[PDB]
């Protein structure tokens, strides 16, 4: 009786209360979203199990007898555009996933990330030098946002008259509003056109960047990446490379400001920063929801999910499951955050974890170390949270530098 509609304000206003209600009733339940029926998984155990079950595919390009596969993330995307966004690690199942991840991991390494620490510190310092030292500034527009973008552009060899453009496109693709569908499909074409030009430019003039590296990358047993895989991989690395990092820095600043106790704990011991980052991700996971497609009938938590169903694994809800995390609504930077699902679970585990932790640690440490009297420019209850189950974040965060 009464299936929940994920488009309602209950999933965007104090949404975590709605998750607890649902999980209590049934960790696995049928819902409606973007006009289609789906199953949402709010339980921790149920979420881990689902992400570990390979009968739940991550490939939207797959064709099934009399079935039209529709992953919500692709609302309004023309098919040619869809395939450019969907021919990479996160959009492939083994054995394709296996080789794509192997070829990329040869170049996208911890060594390459570590060598970037000096540059990310410098960029952080510059951005902070620019905000001044007094008044109210949107910490997102002046810090949280440009920091991750500069780092990903340098890593991929993207430049000046390009950056900032994909910011607005990214902004449109982040939300699925049925009425803005084609405007969504349009920004998507632009992102693609940009990438196509970027890769060809790099083929013509290779450098020390990661993208040049991926173009030459080769393996004896796996081979090389096709033009399409290369273009799709560059697209996801660019997009996923900065968007969630923005959410981490913005939500994190917001969190520490509203929990003075935890902020004091951090300023005191810098060695407590790393776990603070983990607790911020656990508390409000940017990728609140992850999508899977049931290639076969699958039983999740005693519930049979019919074949060909769309499954929304709510990573965000699972992180606040009381049986896994006691007092899940208490933001505690000292708690064991082991096992949260914010970077995924299983084969599709986040390849970008090292870079994300680097940015969050360096950013927040630099932010709060520089502004000891930093405070929220607005009332905590007035902070506008982005309406997206795909990726949570704060688009505007006014803070007072001097207090
Ligand atoms: C705040 C940090 C981030 C969070 C919360 C995050 C979260 C995730 C999650 C939840 C997944 C799994 C998605 C699924 O199972 O369908 C994932 C996958 C992935 N992430 Fe991250 N991520 C972050 C930053 C990054 C960065 C900086 C990059 C690097 C360019 C990146 C690259 C990827 C890629 C390529 C995958 C696909 C992995 C695969 O399919 O094999 N991520 N990430
Ligand atoms: C989790 C994630 C990473 C960081 C970020 O900022 C936003 C997202 C949401 C979309 C995810 C992406 C990871 C790569 C994924 C799985 C694909 O291959 C298609 C969907 C896409
Ligand atoms: C999460 C994300 C990151 C950067 C950004 O600016 C906006 C978005 C939302 C659309 C995501 C994209 C990551 C790549 C995704 C998952 C695809 O492969 C299709 C939909 C698309």
Curated annotation (Swiss-Prot):
Cofactor names: heme
EC number: 1.14.15.35
Top-level taxon of origin: Bacteria
Effects seen without this gene: Gene disruption leads to the accumulation of 6-deoxyerythromycin A, an antibiotic with increased stability at low pH.
GO biological process, one term: erythromycin biosynthetic process
Functional pathway: Antibiotic biosynthesis; erythromycin biosynthesis
Reactions mediated catalytically: 6-deoxyerythronolide B + 2 reduced [2Fe-2S]-[ferredoxin] + O2 + 2 H(+) = erythronolide B + 2 oxidized [2Fe-2S]-[ferredoxin] + H2O
SUPFAM superfamilies: Cytochrome P450 (SSF48264)
Single annotated GO MF: iron ion binding
Enzyme class: oxidoreductase
Keyword annotations: Antibiotic biosynthesis, Cytoplasm, Heme, Iron, Metal-binding, Monooxygenase, Oxidoreductase
Subcellular location field: Cytoplasm
Major location category of this protein: cytoplasm
UniProt-annotated binding residues for heme: 350
A GO CC annotation given for this chain: cytoplasm
InterPro entries per record: Cyt_P450, Cyt_P450_B, Cyt_P450_CS, Cyt_P450_sf
Role, per record: Catalyzes the conversion of 6-deoxyerythronolide B (6-DEB) to erythronolide B (EB) by the insertion of an oxygen at the 6S position of 6-DEB. Requires the participation of a ferredoxin and a ferredoxin reductase for the transfer of electrons from NADPH to the monooxygenase.
Additional free-text comment from the UniProt record: The bound substrate forms no direct hydrogen bonds with the protein.
Entry similarity comment: Belongs to the cytochrome P450 family.
The protein's name in its UniProt record: 6-deoxyerythronolide B hydroxylase
């Amino acid at each position: 009786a009464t299936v929940p509609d994920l488009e309602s304000d209950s999933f965007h206003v104090d949404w975590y209360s709605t998750y607890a209600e649902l999980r209590e009733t049934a960790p696995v339940t049928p819902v409606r979203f973007l006009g289609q029926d789906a199953w949402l998984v709010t339980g921790y155990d149920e979420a881990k199990a689902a992400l570990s079950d390979l009968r739940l595919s991550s490939d939207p390009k797959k064709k099934y007898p009399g079935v039209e596969v529709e992953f919500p993330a692709y609302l309004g995307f023309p098919e040619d555009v869809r395939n450019y966004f969907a021919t990479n690690m996160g959009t492939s199942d083994p054995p394709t996933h296996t080789r794509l991840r192997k070829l990329v991991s040869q170049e996208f390494t911890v060594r390459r990330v570590e060598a970037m620490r000096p540059r990310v510190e410098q960029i952080t310092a510059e951005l902070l030098d620019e905000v001044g030292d007094s008044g109210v500034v949107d910490i997102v527009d002046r810090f949280a946002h440009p920091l991750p973008i500069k780092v990903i552009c340098e890593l991929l060899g993207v430049d000046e008259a390009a950056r900032g453009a994909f910011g607005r496109w990214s902004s449109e693709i982040l939300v699925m509003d049925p009425e803005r569908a084609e405007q969504r499909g349009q920004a998507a074409r632009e992102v693609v056109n940009f990438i196509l030009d970027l890769v060809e430019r790099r083929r013509t003039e290779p450098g020390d960047d990661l993208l040049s590296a991926l173009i030459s990358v080769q393996d004896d047993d796996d081979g090389r990446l096709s033009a399409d895989e290369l273009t799709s991989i560059a697209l996801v690395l660019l997009l996923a490379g900065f968007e969630a990092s923005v959410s981490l820095i913005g939500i994190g600043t917001y969190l520490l400001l509203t929990h003075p106790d935890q902020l004091a704990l951090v300023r005191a011991d810098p060695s407590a920063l790393p776990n603070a980052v983990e607790e911020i991700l656990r508390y409000i996971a940017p990728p609140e929801t992850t999508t899977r497609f049931a290639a076969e009938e699958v039983e999740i938590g005693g519930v049979a999910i019919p074949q060909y169903s769309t499954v929304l694994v709510a990573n965000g809800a699972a992180n606040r499951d009381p049986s896994q995390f006691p007092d899940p609504h208490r933001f505690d930077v000292t708690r064991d955050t082991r096992g949260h699902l914010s970077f995924g679970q299983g084969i599709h585990f986040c390849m970008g974890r090292p870079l994300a932790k680097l940015e969050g640690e360096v950013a927040l440490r630099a932010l709060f170390g520089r502004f000891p009297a930093l405070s929220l420019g607005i009332d905590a209850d007035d902070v506008v949270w982005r309406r997206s189950l795909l990726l949570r974040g704060i688009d505007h965060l006014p803070v007072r530098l001097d207090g």
